[PDB]
């Protein structure tokens, strides 16, 4: 059992060594900055932002399957991976943040609309600028 | 898996995750304010859906509350999986408007995706001296021939808060009543 838990751990470390990356970042941030644009700042929700979560919730479907093929961890594994408290204090809150948002609406949208609030001040520094 | 990453959350058995469902005027941003101690003086028709989320009883309720509009129900189905808890919020007072409600109560719980959910009904708007009562509305929509899940009606008012946490108090008594069922299935 003890040795059994040793692999658990370097299940954790594997899988937050693949959160870390970017073969998992990137499509993530890819994704968050074409679609965040209509996620205004504002307490009521739009219809789309539940078709847009949608969305993101395949695209994380689909990372951690392929990660999960290319490596060669079944999903009995990533599930007591993710059930120890390792997965907690191994991650960080950041590199959990657009894992938590599959589930969690609530942290997508505050995601959505902080990357819309960025690319739109880019965007107004820029006309700032060429004038 | 998506299922899994649940296993992440702080504390993912203390969360519960509330439908809110009713007619568009029915007075569920109001209530949804209420139970947030908000203000509730500039509330206007909800074109997409609100979340708040309430500490209560030991439990973080997170309660969405979706727009009641005719053009937004067929929008209501996006919203129905992994629904803890479903309360269903009717204006007393607007009888002209009980059939329309009674029909989207019946589909609610024909649904396959709420199935074992508990229901809440509350009858809304009791301040008004027009108010039906909540025996009236219960025998109204034949609430006793509901199956294959718990239900309570309670009479409120949103606006004035009373009768709200009465209610709120069955839910929080009915936490695991889906799972609990849905394990005896
Ligand atoms: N007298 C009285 N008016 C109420 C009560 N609850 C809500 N109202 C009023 O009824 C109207 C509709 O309220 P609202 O909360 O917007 O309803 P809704 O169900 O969210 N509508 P929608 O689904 O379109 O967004 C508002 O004028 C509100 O003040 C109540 O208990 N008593
Ligand atoms: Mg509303």
Redesign the interface.
Same mark, same amino acid.
Request: no cysteine.
């Given at each position: 059992a003890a040795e059994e838990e040793d692999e658990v751990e370097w299940v954790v470390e594997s899988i937050a060594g693949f959160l870390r990356g970017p073969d998992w970042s990137i499509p993530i941030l890819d994704f968050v900055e074409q679609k965040c644009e209509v996620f205004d700042d504002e307490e009521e929700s739009k219809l789309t932002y539940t078709e847009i979560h949608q969305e993101y919730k395949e695209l994380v479907e689909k990372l951690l399957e392929s990660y999960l093929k290319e490596i060669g961890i079944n999903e009995d594994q990533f599930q007591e991976a993710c059930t120890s408290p390792l997965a907690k204090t191994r991650t960080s809150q950041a590199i959990l943040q657009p894992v938590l948002a599959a589930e969690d609406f609530t942290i997508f949208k505050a995601m959505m609309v902080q990357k819309n609030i960025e690319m739109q001040l880019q965007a107004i520094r820029i006309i700032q600028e060429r004038n | !898996? !998506? #299922?899994? !990453?649940?296993? !992440?959350?702080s504390a993912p058995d203390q969360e519960v995750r509330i439908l809110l469902l009713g007619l568009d005027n029915a007075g569920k941003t109001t209530l949804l304010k209420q139970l947030a101690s908000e203000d509730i003086s500039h509330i206007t028709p909800?074109?997409?859906?609100?979340?708040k #989320?309430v500490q209560s009883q030991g439990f973080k309720l997170?309660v969405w509350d979706i727009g009641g509009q005719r053009k937004?129900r067929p @929008?209501w189905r #996006? @919203?129905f999986e992994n629904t803890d808890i479903l309360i269903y919020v009717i204006d007393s007072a607007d009888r002209k408007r009980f059939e329309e409600t009674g029909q989207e109560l019946t589909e609610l719980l024909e649904e396959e995706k709420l199935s074992c959910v508990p229901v809440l009904i509350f009858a809304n708007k009791q301040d008004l001296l027009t108010a039906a009562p909540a025996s009236e509305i219960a025998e109204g929509l034949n609430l006793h021939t509901i199956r294959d899940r718990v239900w309570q009606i309670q009479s409120c008012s949103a606006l004035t808060g009373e009768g709200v946490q009465d209610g709120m108090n069955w839910v929080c008594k009915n936490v695991n009543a889906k799972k609990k069922l849905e394990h005896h299935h």
């Open positions: - | !898996l !998506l #299922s899994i !990453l649940r296993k !992440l959350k909800t074109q997409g859906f609100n979340i #989320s997170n937004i @929008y #996006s @919203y």
